[PDB]
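Job type: complex structure
Entries:
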Amino acid sequence: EYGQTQKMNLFQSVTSALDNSLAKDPTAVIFGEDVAFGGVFRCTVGLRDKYGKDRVFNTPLCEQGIVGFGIGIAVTGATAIAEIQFADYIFPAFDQIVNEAAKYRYRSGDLFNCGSLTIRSPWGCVGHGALYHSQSPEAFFAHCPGIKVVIPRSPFQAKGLLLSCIEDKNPCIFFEPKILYRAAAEEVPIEPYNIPLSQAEVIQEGSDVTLVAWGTQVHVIREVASMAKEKLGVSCEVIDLRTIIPWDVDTICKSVIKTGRLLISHEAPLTGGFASEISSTVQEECFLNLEAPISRVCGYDTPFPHIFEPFYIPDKWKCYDALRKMINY
Amino acid sequence: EYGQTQKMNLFQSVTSALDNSLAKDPTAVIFGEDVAFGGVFRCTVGLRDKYGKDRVFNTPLCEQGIVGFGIGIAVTGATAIAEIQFADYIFPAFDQIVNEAAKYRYRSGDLFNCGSLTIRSPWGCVGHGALYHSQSPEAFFAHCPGIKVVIPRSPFQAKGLLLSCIEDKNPCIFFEPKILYRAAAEEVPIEPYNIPLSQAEVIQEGSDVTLVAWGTQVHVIREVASMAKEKLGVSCEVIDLRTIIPWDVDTICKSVIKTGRLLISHEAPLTGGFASEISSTVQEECFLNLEAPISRVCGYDTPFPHIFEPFYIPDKWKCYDALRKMINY
Amino acid sequence: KPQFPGASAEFIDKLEFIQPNVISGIPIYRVMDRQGQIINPSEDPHLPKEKVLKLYKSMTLLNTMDRILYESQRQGRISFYMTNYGEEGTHVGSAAALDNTDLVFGQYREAGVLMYRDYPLELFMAQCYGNISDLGKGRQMPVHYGCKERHFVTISSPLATQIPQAVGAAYAAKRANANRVVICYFGEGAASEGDAHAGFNFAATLECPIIFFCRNNGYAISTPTSEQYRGDGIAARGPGYGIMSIRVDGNDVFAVYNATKEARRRAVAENQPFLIEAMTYRDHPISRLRHYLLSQGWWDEEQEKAWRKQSRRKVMEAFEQAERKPKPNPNLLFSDVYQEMPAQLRKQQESLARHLQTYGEHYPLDHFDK
Amino acid sequence: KPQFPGASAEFIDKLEFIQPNVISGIPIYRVMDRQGQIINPSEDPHLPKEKVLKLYKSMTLLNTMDRILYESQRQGRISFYMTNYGEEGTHVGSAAALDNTDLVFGQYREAGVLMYRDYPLELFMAQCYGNISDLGKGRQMPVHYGCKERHFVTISSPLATQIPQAVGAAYAAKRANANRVVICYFGEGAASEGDAHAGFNFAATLECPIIFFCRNNGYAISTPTSEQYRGDGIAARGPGYGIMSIRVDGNDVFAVYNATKEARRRAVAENQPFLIEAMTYRDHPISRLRHYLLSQGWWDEEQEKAWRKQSRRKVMEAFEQAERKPKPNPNLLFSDVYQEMPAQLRKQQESLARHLQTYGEHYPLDHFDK
Ligand SMILES: Cc1ncc(C[n+]2csc(CCOP(=O)(O)OP(=O)(O)O)c2C)c(N)n1
Ligand SMILES: Cc1ncc(C[n+]2csc(CCOP(=O)(O)OP(=O)(O)O)c2C)c(N)n1
Ligand SMILES: [Cl-]
Ligand SMILES: [Cl-]
Ligand SMILES: [K+]
Ligand SMILES: [K+]
Ligand SMILES: [K+]
Ligand SMILES: [K+]
Ligand SMILES: [Mn+2]
Ligand SMILES: [Mn+2]
């Protein structure tokens, strides 16, 4: 379908995406803390030697500066791919993102824009990251019209989605599940390709219950579906949301009209998490089809803990038990 | 009930709250941009002359500094009441709030805390504030365990709620609806009093539909209830949520079990707004009681516009039309 | 001999703290005195008459427009207005020293830059009124000007955010290699924000052709500079970032012009940042330039009278046409959030159209287009 | 004579940019040479033997603990570890110059401060293991130490956030009037964050008794200082904020001690900030102090051997007890989010307890308390 492939883990598929972008776009540059030597998660290995020190470069240690700087590059029409080292450290740049990047086009009547900006950032739990190496900030950004928030589940998905972000004419935040960086490899096309933004993917068809998740949590719900089928005779539709905003309301609603049941899962805390937006929307569009309450299986409403991580995450047993109760409602 | 009262508009009730706090707490200080001369909305008039220039003082123009500074004061046990000049300008401090203030107690095992910190900020639309003088940021903060977010509907409510924030042993954000600062006065007790946090108030009992809102939008839904009763024969229960997080789930659920219908309204954009958290929660607890889908009548998913404000806000006609459709479902 | 990678320095064998010199700070560069007299002939730029008259007419025309729109604001005809008083010479003198395609970022006090680049009175007015002629589509508060044609990036209200952005634009210009500087205006108040620190440092380490233009008028709203900083103003910060810095008399268009011309020349050639701090008041740039014109034989009372009259009429013609224009179609509240309109945003647009069909009598529809 | 409120300055009649001096920067203060010899007798603090031996033993005991926990991290027994190598003298020398109740904010390289204030090996270890003895309740990553009893504010991972906080604590101390300084440690990397700019400026304008202690080791992870700033290190920034500044040899405990003692004395008396920049390497503080001890007759090979042995045993006793302790009860994941536990958080706590009753065989329950 896509030409020659090779086995890549998530970090290598990111490098491949970034390589293909620099090769085909003479304006593109990549910048952030420690990107020159290859990055702390190895996502930029070899790019500076290949493309030059004026295209792949270190900034001072200042997240609000990195984002402000990226916006100014994009204001001239050049592709700016900014890295924030951990998603937990995106918050200093929150005003640059929310008040500036997201509103740049609207407030100028489209005289100016920073659509050629993409911010990439490692995201999600890692087993031992505790408070500041584990966060999933996507719900903070979902409430800000004018930006796109995109999260891949795999290497193949990551390269296609990142290329779409980079080429999309809106400022994009691309969150890379850091626990997958060195996890299993899959086949990833060597040459550029795109996966559409704002499109969910039904990765497994089912008739009894719709499961929705994104990032690593997609693999958790796939396993939950397997446990449901085997232990309960229950047929799950598994959906990778992929784009957080603008999200693919139609695919989720069409699945729930078929099943009549929805469970949404995410690592981020329950309160204010993005599952509440999906739940309240599906409740509005599929009210008459709902056999049971939409269930949200999320992290607890606490900061992300070090030694208690195993008890914090919405793991497959947590999801399975909720699904079981939902099936019995 | 509360001793001697006098007529106060919202800004005067804030000054009264702040006066009473400084009088009774020798550690309390108030600081921010332009607070010394009385503030740009007059909330600190007379306090510096009364309490001294070391207790009521101007900071440099730096929101991340103001919040960081307030946290450090509170770390020693002293009351720190920080002002951010417009809620739209709270974002530079977002990392100080979310990563620092909210997590201070948890991450230290309660060895250290900044519970004696309160951040107050003008909030909500004002007729002509456009993008950066109109915002309602409360949903951004609702997804951050460890802080409290509190929004009053009136002068009486504002003083009682602000005193509770200031004395509460958790970092609090108090959002003051700036359109009410100079609006109608009401009777406000001269001496200190408290209104409990995390408690909604049923301001008008009803049997057909529950309306929920906070801030200025409470007055809008009160009017909607009056239009429903007169035009439709419909009996509305009107609820002021007051505290955004931790919110009063019980009062909202108990009302919806009685009515079977819920409409939530807020000025903030629909997607990711706090109505989705309320809706998804009530859907979970009151699933079997729901006669119609929970309706959310919110600002549009755009930045807050200057000349189009009249068409943007979730006004009484917007709310009324949704209520009408919900009643007919 | 010290072997530390962080700093190039000798050893010292005695304990000695470095004291700031704030009592005798960076001196203030001046070309003409308060009587419009050139102090040092070798510093005279000898600008030609046509150009000096354009500086004078731009400053005064701005001041005329300020008077009228300030009154408009007072009567609530417009909702907000920031004036340019005391700032006319910093803006027109610096603008005159740029190339026309040099990209400008600023905030609230930069209307003079646009005036010098011949932005139509009609468009200043359209923005303050949010009418159909506004390219900003009436979306922002008044005085939030932007012009793509005149390389003037749209103003936003959050202070200092444009400073690291201006650095990114300067970096991109460096790579594009077509000999352009960026200038970035901000007040002394805004210089306290973390974003100023970000921008100054990124410009120096990334080697960007940018002029930082700080307007120091001694006040940020009610806050005197004694509450804003304790060093020697903003100019003394520049050297600590590795930035070449100068302080100038903001009431002297020639001093502002000279420092900006030289900062532009060296920024573009060397790819390095320059910091100008222009001292102003919250002795006036217009009257000082007026005295200069008279001593040259280049202006007189009769021309001054005729010009006050003509510029008042031009502004009033614009003002009245601006007030009489309709506002943009309310549909424009939904476009440009993203480049394309997401299907869910379009649904909100359609729900508004549906709403206005039933409830339209309750909205101010007669003032809006279509 | 200039009449500008923003700056105290003369006029100048010639155009002159201010150039940074980075080639010959603020000189590096040194008390003893690389052979442990006092260079300038009038600068010798003449610390008594007992105190100098405590500095030496604290530095070496830290270094012993570093060796072992670094190995522990390598084998995945602990998940993370930051060492203190090259930083032992900046931390133990500065700590020795403080009063015991002076409040300390820092980050990753400040374990030596705690070691000097006699923090138990058991508690260093309990934190890295997240075991039941941790007062932090196992909630943060390893090396995120805090001790309320020893006035050492709990470390958090986001860089530079503690700098404006340390300023607020210094302000509150000023008002409380009981003669206390705050010290705030950060690296040269973290000094690029907007929060450093915030803290430095607030300290100067609000007149706070704070010492800013910047450790400049030439690197932030992979980033050399040539990519971090272009001025003369961090010390040259201090004066631009109105802050008294000094640069010291971070390998010289006596230089660090002297500068900190004098900064503390003047900060508390005058209520004003001081900036110390200590130059280190990413020639060693331990071996330099060792040479000094030998020249005094205060240490020898036999004591060095006996001390290496005893400190290795103390660390290994702590290490093994730390590994054998259970982890805290999983209920502690829910407490201290707020001071009280909100009813909805308690409901989540109860749902976990319910979950673990059915599915407990799938969780590592045998390592956790109750
Ligand atoms: C981030 C932020 N905080 C606060 C404000 C409110 N504000 C608008 S102008 C101003 C003072 C700006 O002072 P300065 O930068 O000195 O410019 P000047 O008004 O003197 O020209 C303030 C505090 C704002 N627009 N943005
Ligand atoms: C806000 C933020 N951004 C990035 C990081 C990742 N990070 C951890 S240490 C470090 C380098 C810090 O360098 P410096 O301040 O020089 O201290 P040093 O490690 O040299 O002692 C970085 C970038 C972080 N913890 N916080
Ligand atoms: Cl403003
Ligand atoms: Cl880190
Ligand atoms: K993009
Ligand atoms: K509080
Ligand atoms: K701005
Ligand atoms: K920190
Ligand atoms: Mn100013
Ligand atoms: Mn360093």
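Summary: The pocket of chloride ion (ligand 3) is lined by residues C 157 (CB under 6 Å). The domain at 1-370 of chain D is CATH 3.40.50.970 (Rossmann fold).
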